[model samples]
Target: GLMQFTLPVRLCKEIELFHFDIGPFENMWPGIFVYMVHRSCGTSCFELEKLCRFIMSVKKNYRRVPYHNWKHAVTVAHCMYAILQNNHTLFTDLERKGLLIACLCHDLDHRGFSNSYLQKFDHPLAALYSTSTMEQHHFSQTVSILQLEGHNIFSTLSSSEYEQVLEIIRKAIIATDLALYFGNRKQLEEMYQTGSLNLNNQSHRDRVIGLMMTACDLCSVTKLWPVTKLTANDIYAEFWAEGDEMKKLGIQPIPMMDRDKKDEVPQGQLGFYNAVAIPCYTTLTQILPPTEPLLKACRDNLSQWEKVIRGEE
Candidate 1:
């Protein structure tokens, strides 16, 4: 707790640390951050040690599930960074800050289970959250991580500003639920169709944030075909585990979940593209043109999956 003084010493020199590592740390880089000294504290919150520790905590908390693991979290977070950074004008710096953190924390401690999986199994979390069971836990976990020692990257913000960002993180994380995704997309798409989607409006801004959350959450299906196929395999590897559990518990697994019907995997992928990914990216690019690559990548994967189904590849 002592080291508050900006002591100066070096090999025949002394320097004030501005955007560089400091005492009791090495490399101490803050990913997605690495600053906004613009907060009320009148000081920098780029506390590398704290941010690094927080990231490590978030990483370990994401249970080593096949699909919704730390790898997936980083994948989604990186995608959000690319999306927001490339189009920085669309959102405030603070909004992007909240969004990046939400992406990293959206599936915290997923246990490779869906919301319904927890509900169907009568999990205590299900009782705690009557709806959005798993998503609520993820947001809760995000809060917990922030409360941990030296973890609040937003620590320099004024209290009200801190709360505001936290709320942003909460909404962003919960919006990852697919049940909400459809409604979110509907509202945003209609706004576009009606020519009334004004980012100047807070409601419109929030709507876009929610829709983008789904887009980033659906990153697996919007990757290169080679990459997406493995991601798909990992998704079902987790799904089939739950399905195996269901069978053992005397429940019939859904067709996609049934490893027995593994032959239908390609068919299921095709259905998913038509039903969700393609339509999403199609609308997404129409609204936000830079995301066209996502649509292209999504369609390419769909065709590859279809070829697999047709025994053409």
Candidate 2:
């Protein structure tokens, strides 16, 4: 259990404006967990519900928007579930839980765009901590919420048990830093082949959480085939939304200010799909066989999106 601290003013204002949409108190936790943790199963459901409600009530609530709102949480949950079916070996019990929790809460206060953009804007989240350290802060904040009087979900656990639980949650949340992506994957593959997590295996929850969050965050690359095109569209919309926010603040927008223009993504998305997305999912499916279908779906979506981007369809 952790104590509260001074809340960020912008976060405070945003919460006031959006709290009604997030939901009422009792329902807030359940909704956030179920909506964010994928399929909402047995203990996961119960635990996340408690966690979400606690975090939501923080004096300074998070900024909510279409891309970073409840809907996004739901999307991450769904993706996590999909990945889990074929990739159980990739995560242990604690690791799996942390991943789902991280997914639900990763963008709690996202200011839109990537971390690069956040740092560029001198945002408080960026100012308060560097990339990994700041994310750890957010994760700690979530844990702090759970310790509320009637809200401690892990209360049944012994002191040692609770400490272990805290460790899992912290590791998972911190691992989602995009900067750690390739490095983590490279190390993970080495461990997978050698059948040794090295000392890191003790923190399996953290590693799994990081991977799952990364996969979900980058899922636009390998979503279902039919929906891949939509994913691309959404990416454009998301970028445009950020650009709009920047313009309103009288700051120069990042590239791709004209959402209507088809050329806003990288090379835009064409070269990106053929090179990065295609190979990434092809390899991800190898790690979790159940992901094959989803990866195929993503490829299908990729082809369609490619066509749309090329004016072929």
Candidate 3:
């Protein structure tokens, strides 16, 4: 934890207002994470000083990458925090702890590159964890953080509660991989269509909570136009960095990542909303009506992207 100190009044005010759905806007992230952990699992379960220390440590662990840096991690965590504020009953006590922690720690130490890049480049992480390589490393790194002295925020939970939280933490973190989202959302939707998506069922609840992680992970697209627009620009830069690397390796990168194909970005954005973002948002609103604002925001952004793709002003 770097230069441990109290949350400055300005940043603390933003944290206080975060629960009101106004400004989670790029403020002091460690403050947000500490508040979120306290909100979810309760301050009684974790010491304020220790938890703040842990959050700051996690903050430091994040790389200074363009898209996958600490900022993205905290934003995802806050989105989950926003959801749980209203839907607390949707998750078990331990699961809420898991989800929030997983959100903050989900993309730990990301290289600003995709899992595919690690695989093709024969990165050791790829070999170490079959697929979902980055996520596997993320969870591994989370555990490493917990192992550090003064970083175990779950110290007060019972052994049993402690154990289950770690399990769901891994489940929640791994599901942030969009490939897993692509793989799992159908089963989730099918369970919904068949009316078998019972929250009381342990397995069903597991799947639902897992999907919620991805929901928050992608929630940037549901932000206001300028917010999402800037986010998309940063992601393209990150992907293009990878694309540039792939070229040096004598491989062709996908158009979405290729700087030479920059004109296709609007098309890619359009396709993403249709294929993933809208579907995911719609599914959430179906089960969790409080997410309706997110669904509405996503639709508005989609229309904006649609206009751009059509060359309309």
Query: Judged by lDDT, which candidate is best?
Result: 3
Query: Which scores better on TM-score, 1 or 2?
Result: 1
Q: Which stretches of candidate 1 lie over 4 Å from their true place?
A: 1-45
Query: What value does the lDDT take at residue 240 in candidate 3?
Result: 98
lDDT of 3: 0.81
Question: What order do candidates take by TM-score, descending?
Answer: 3, 1, 2
Q: Rank the candidates by lDDT, best first.
A: 3, 1, 2
Please write out the lDDT profile of model 1 over residues 160-221, one tens digit for every residue. 88988998898898889898878888887788999998879977777788878888888777
Whole-model lDDT, candidate 2? Answer: 0.56
Per residue, candidate 3 scores C-alpha lDDT tens digits across 11-96 of 55554332222244555556657766776666665677777787888888898788898888878888888788767676677777
In model 1, pairs of residues that clash are none
Better of 1 and 2 by lDDT: 1
Model 3: weakest 10-residue lDDT segment is 15-24
Candidate 2 displacement at residue 232 in angstroms: 3.9
